[PDB]
Design a protein around this nucleic acid. Structure first.
Lengths: 46, 120, 110, 56
RNA sequence: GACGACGUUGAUAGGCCGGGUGUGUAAGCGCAGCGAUGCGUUGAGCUAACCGGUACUAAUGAACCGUGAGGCUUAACCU
RNA sequence: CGAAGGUGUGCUGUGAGGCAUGCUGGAGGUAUCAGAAGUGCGAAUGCUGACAUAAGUAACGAUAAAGCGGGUGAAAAGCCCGCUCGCCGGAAGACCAAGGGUUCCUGUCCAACGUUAAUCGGGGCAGGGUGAGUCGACCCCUAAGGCGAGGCCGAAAGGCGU
RNA sequence: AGGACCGAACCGACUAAUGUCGAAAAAUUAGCGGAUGACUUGUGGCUGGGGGUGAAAGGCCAAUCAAACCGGGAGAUAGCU
RNA sequence: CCCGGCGAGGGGAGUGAAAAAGAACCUGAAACCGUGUACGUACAAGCAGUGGGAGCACGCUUAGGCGUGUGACUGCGUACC
RNA sequence: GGUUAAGCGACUAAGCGUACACGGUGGAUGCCCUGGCAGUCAGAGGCGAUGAAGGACGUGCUAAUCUGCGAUAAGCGUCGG
């Protein structure tokens, strides 16, 4: 079947990327919670 | 229910079955010995013994008859050209089956088929 | 004098090695080698490779006598498991556990 | 296809009362070579009733 | 798995010769036709399991489990 | 010259228990009398770890197809070669973008992985290989569209936008 | 010329089978409807939970939809096991 | 050092207080799984126990008979929450 | 002593049951700590455009990862202990 995750890096980058999530203040809290919860991989990097 | 039938199926379709028994009988006379399982050894006998039967009384027409059933003239070259005086007197059987043993591959009852007259 | 040989973690199951190492209970060695050379199995690859290692432990460490040498006890006992995951249909899995077994061969002259 | 009440290890044993491997103790000795093969079979060195039959 | 037939004091299987059966005028030559093809050879040839024989090959000497005159008591017959 | 714990044993109390002791064990335990509670488990389709059962049953993943000889090797229906047989051929062929990121290749190894064995493998150990003024991007130019200097607008964030 | 005809690709899902502890959390073989249109596909964007979007089935919104999912109120509450 | 596939695994030897401390390593219970010895068992049915009990097998005392194991057969008896 | 009959009658155990001795899997119990929770007591109560918190990629004799550090890279100078 046409399964749901038909992936890319172009869809991925402009949605869940760094400068996307660290654009707005509501995004920024996720970057300031993934920090404080001590996650290694912040959002997506290659 | 098999009652008075013959010719074991060997778990292949008739078209596959006939085409294997060609390329074993082609392989049989070229190297003079083969290792097979027990039933194929027991039923390559019922197939090959026509060939050296129909190759003592040599003719022109029986060349194609062992080419319609063989389609391998190199095997037909060994027939009629050595096998003639090799088998003038043997009115009947030409195979001394040997029960070798057991296939270490998959537990088959392995065996050995040969032409009787062996000196090499 | 008595001697023991063990193959540990033989990659099979207990009933698979129990069946051929039931016949060689209470036998002599040369009739046991001859009943294991022609038993068409995998455990007869296993323990016959080890039962000859037991008589080596006699001729070398214990009693060099092999002719009148008995096998007293032989008992295959269980071992660990390789718990892999097998996929069964419709999304649900299946906890396979690839079995493993231990075999002792004990050789002496009672 | 299901079990409703698990059988004991008793009846699990008596189902295994008949699994026992048939012994193949009936070895043979050669006529004129003296070695030992399995009956109606050939040796490791190609002997069968005192003949080098396969020469392998 | 059992039951049955045999194991060289052998026809139990496979082969083989013959017959039987089934399909129909094999192939290869020669003739008639520019040719497809038709005629002669030729009711030929080929023929699964069928039937009757022939040991040609495969069915070996052994090894093996199974023993070594079968308990007690009474009656009836042996002397 | 042997604590707790474990595992049997003889005794003892109305029971919850206690006391002595054989073996295993190898460094801690605790009387009498009192103080405080994460204080006593069979259940709750309780949670977690482990092990049975069905069972050595079912199944081995398309009904394209094998068969033979040789070799390597401790062992070969499956690995390497040769010989035929069979299957695909607007594909089960060969290139590219996406997407995966050493999966390619030689030496070497079989514990584990490969729904089996395995000398083989897209598996592990080790080393190697990707070479562009023209190929694609990066780069110069915009669409849909997202931000958005001044600004308009809005409790605050922020929304729209040149 | 055709929202024209026949029929592959592409697409869709009608009928039966099989499967339904599946080879698959919706498939495979045999057919079936269309196939220059109101079509089909790729890539890149925009819309948002009482809100999106809908040739309208309460269908679809990451296998879940008569109000998605994560966290937070919150150890809600439970005359009920 | 032997045997093995110059594998795994294992038996000796050596260290060490001990390898029934060996890298899956202190201690190592239970379920589950086998080995051996002893007894019962293939005409008997049924919550599988309890009351009675022959024979056999053993540790012993003291030789009179207890203890432990099994337990033919028999009287009652339909698990727990 | 032998013979026919009649009555009665163990050892057989493919496996299974129970108890002991033996390990087999298993990793609970007792014991252990450089691990963590709750606080007493002072001190601090900030880091940040002479570039942060949190990361990427490099640095050694080195393959890798952790600690430290940053083309001066497990470290430099400097004044002391």
């Amino acid at each position: 079947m046409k399964r749901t995750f038909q992936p890319s890096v172009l869809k991925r980058n402009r949605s869940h990327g760094f400068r996307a999530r660290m654009a707005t203040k509501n995004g920024r809290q996720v970057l300031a919670r993934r920090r404080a919860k001590g996650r290694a991989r912040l959002t997506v990097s290659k | 229910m098999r009652h008075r039938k013959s010719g074991r199926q060997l778990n292949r379709n008739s078209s596959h079955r006939q085409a294997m028994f060609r390329n074993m009988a082609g392989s049989l006379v070229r190297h003079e010995i083969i290792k097979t399982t027990l039933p194929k050894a027991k039923e390559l006998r019922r197939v090959v013994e026509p060939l050296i039967t129909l190759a003592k009384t040599d003719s022109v027409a029986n060349r194609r008859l062992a080419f319609a059933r063989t389609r391998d003239n190199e095997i037909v070259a060994k027939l009629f050209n050595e096998l003639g005086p090799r088998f003038a007197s043997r009115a009947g059987g030409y195979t001394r089956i040997l029960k070798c043993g057991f296939r270490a591959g998959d537990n088959a009852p392995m065996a050995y088929i040969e032409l009787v007259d062996r000196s090499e | 004098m008595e001697t023991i040989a063990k193959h540990r973690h033989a990659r099979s199951s207990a009933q698979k090695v129990r069946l051929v190492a039931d016949l060689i209970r209470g036998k002599k060695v040369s009739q046991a080698l001859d009943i294991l050379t022609y038993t068409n199995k995998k455990a007869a690859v296993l323990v016959k490779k080890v039962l000859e290692s037991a008589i080596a432990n006699a001729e070398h460490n214990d009693g060099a006598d092999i002719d009148d040498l008995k096998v007293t006890k032989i008992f295959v006992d269980e071992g660990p498991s390789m718990k892999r995951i097998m996929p069964r249909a419709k999304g649900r899995a299946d906890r396979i556990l690839k079995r493993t077994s231990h075999i002792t061969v004990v050789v002496s002259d009672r | 296809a299901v079990q409703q009440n698990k059988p004991t290890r008793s009846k699990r044993g008596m189902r295994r009362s008949h699994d026992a491997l048939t012994a193949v103790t009936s070895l043979s000795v050669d006529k004129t070579s003296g070695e030992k093969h399995l009956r109606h079979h050939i040796t490791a060195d190609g002997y069968y009733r005192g003949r080098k039959v396969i020469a392998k």
